[PDB]
């Protein structure tokens, strides 16, 4: 839930999976967060660190 | 019934390039599963590569990194995928889901890939 504060969760691969297995790199129903910012100058003028 | 439409399959050379686009009827326009799956014949049904719906973001399998490119909207509410380079192993029939969410998978028809001279 956008994690608690003092949590410090560096996991890896995928929250809690689910109920669809790992199959590979995802599969079907999953995904792999912990994804890179790659934000741009323009995309976004108050969407940018 | 979930209908999924498919277009864009057909006869390519080797080494060729098409444009698939597999669109969905709606699907409760909420979905967080979608990935495209490939049955070769007399082979289990493997994965290719997957799309995410709440951003741009994009996977692939191992083996199709870099030669596809799958993009999607949601003003038109379908995915363009796009093949370069194609190998005679990939003549397969593709198959675009949409797991909706709390439900099970959801499947359509797909269409013939051939690819050969």
């Known amino acids: 839930s956008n994690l608690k504060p003092f949590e410090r969760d560096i996991s890896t691969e995928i929250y809690q999976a689910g109920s669809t297995p790992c199959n590979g790199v995802e599969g079907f129903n999953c995904y792999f967060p912990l994804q890179s910012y790659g934000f741009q100058p323009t995309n976004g003028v108050g969407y940018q660190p | 019934e979930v209908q999924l439409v498919e277009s864009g399959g057909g006869l390519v050379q080797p080494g060729g390039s098409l444009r698939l686009s597999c669109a969905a009827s709606?699907?409760?326009?909420?979905?967080?599963?979608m990935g495209w799956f490939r049955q070769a014949p007399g082979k289990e049904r493997e994965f290719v590569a997957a799309?995410?719906?709440?951003?741009?973001?994009?996977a692939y399998a191992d083996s199709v990194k870099g030669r596809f490119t799958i993009s999607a909207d949601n003003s038109k509410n379908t995915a363009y995928l796009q093949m370069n380079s194609l190998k005679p192993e990939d003549t397969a029939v593709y198959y675009c889901?949409?797991?909706?969410?709390?439900?099970?998978?959801?499947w359509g028809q797909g269409t013939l890939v051939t690819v050969s001279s």
């Open positions: 889901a949409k797991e909706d969410v709390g439900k099970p998978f959801d």
């Open positions: 709606g699907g409760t326009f909420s979905s967080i599963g």
């Open positions: 799309i995410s719906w709440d951003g741009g973001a994009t």
